[PDB]
Ligand binder design. Structure first.
Ligand SMILES: Cc1ccc2nc(NC(=O)CSc3nc4c(c(=O)n3-c3ccccc3)SCC4)sc2c1
Ligand code: NA
Ligand code: NA
Lengths: 236, 228
């Protein structure tokens, strides 16, 4: 993506080097008092929260390119005690202290706009998925996640749109939709298999009825059309 | 809130004049091709979406002072087909076409950062609620919004924290929920005291809405302080 690529060059030409991360490592963690701007360039992460008793709550998944900020831009204080965990095999990220980010975005408002609108995408995304979960429950949520994965990682084949994403575990798909006990994930997947919306062949899901997914995750479909029209359009 | 006041003054000095809306009016709506940045100075609004079914879903509640942007700052296209509806009797809001917001914010970045941080508040807020609901189901969820009412509209009284928000608007907000409420009052958390309900056990709400309590501490520290 162009704006991301420009942002990447802006950061590098200002002395910020890319870091390489590996599966299961934390780019930032919930016990660090320093807050950061993470430019996740390539790879997949998840935001997590570890509770009092050690329970791990998976709250949000992100793919590069994207901007995750662990602290408020103005106060530089924490927006929440969260970790950012790499779930792809490796990931490339630029880690900027928030105070350094303010100075960087201050000097080029084109990049300020890019980061601002990334936040706007996150806001409307959470609203869209709450909208879909409120109407259709876990089915809307699972349909939404599958739709997003289909738009981002889909490859049309004679067997349907192949979700070309490795390590796409059922519980990993469950977590990304908001479902901890994988009882519900396997069940919803069974309804979608029975109604021929998806098949699971080789190691991937193949979407056979995109219209069905869009029908039960309509607000997330609209979110993708408004936020990423060029990606939405490739499969519409 | 100080950044908000300075933002209000910054808008007025640049000609932006506020408008008072009344309950059920739409400050912006899902059918308008033009997008807006709303500085909600005073009052209570809800973000709604009217589905194809004709169903009206309540997605978010906003209280002044706060900023709600119906369109992307760069592209000026919609972030979603949403309405912003007034649920307080009146509300004061500054309505800025998003074209103009870009120039307003470029001139003074202190206010750019203010608007930027309202977005971060929304993002973290949604994740905090999702965390509580995923751990404690509907109990966390109920506890969460009882916690919100307690913090935003809580007065220390002899009988606990009286929810001081006008009960005219309490209805807007409000299945298995009846049972959850009964166990609440059953377990003394909230007391039915002549239709003036009181929160008698903040620690219980805090216990089952922990990530939302943390969000208030981190995002609204003055508000969080009063009842802690
Ligand atoms: C193993 C596993 C499991 C689930 C999963 N989900 C993935 N991808 C996504 O969830 C889409 S990435 C994304 N997330 C968000 C926003 C966003 O803009 N994106 C995004 C980024 C780049 C391109 C398209 C969408 S705003 C708030 C969350 S991977 C992934 C990998
Ligand atoms: Na941290
Ligand atoms: Na609109």
């Amino acid at each position: 993506n162009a704006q991301a690529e420009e942002f990447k060059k802006y950061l590098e030409t200002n002395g910020i080097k890319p870091k390489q991360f590996h599966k299961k490592e934390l780019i930032f963690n919930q016990w660090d008092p320093q807050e950061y701007c993470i430019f996740l360039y390539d790879g997949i992460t998840k935001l997590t929260s570890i509770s009092e008793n050690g329970t791990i709550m998976n709250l949000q998944y992100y793919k590069g390119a994207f901007v995750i900020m662990s602290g408020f831009i103005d106060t530089e204080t924490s927006v929440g005690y969260y970790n950012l965990e790499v779930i792809s095999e490796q990931a490339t990220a630029y880690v900027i202290k928030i105070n350094e980010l303010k100075e960087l975005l201050s000097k080029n408002l084109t990049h300020f706009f890019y980061v601002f609108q990334t936040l706007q995408k996150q806001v409307s995304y959470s609203l869209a998925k709450f909208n879909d979960f409120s109407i259709n429950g876990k089915l809307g949520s699972i349909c939404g996640q599958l739709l997003i994965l289909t738009y981002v990682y889909g490859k049309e084949t004679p067997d349907g749109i192949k979700i070309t994403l490795d390590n796409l575990t059922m519980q990993e798909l469950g977590y990304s939709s908001g479902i901890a006990h994988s009882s519900a994930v396997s069940r919803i997947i069974s309804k979608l298999k029975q109604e021929k919306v998806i098949v699971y062949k080789n190691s991937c899901f193949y979407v056979q009825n995109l219209d069905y997914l869009k029908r039960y995750a309509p607000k997330l479909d609209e979110w993708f059309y408004l936020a990423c029209p060029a990606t939405w359009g490739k499969l519409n």
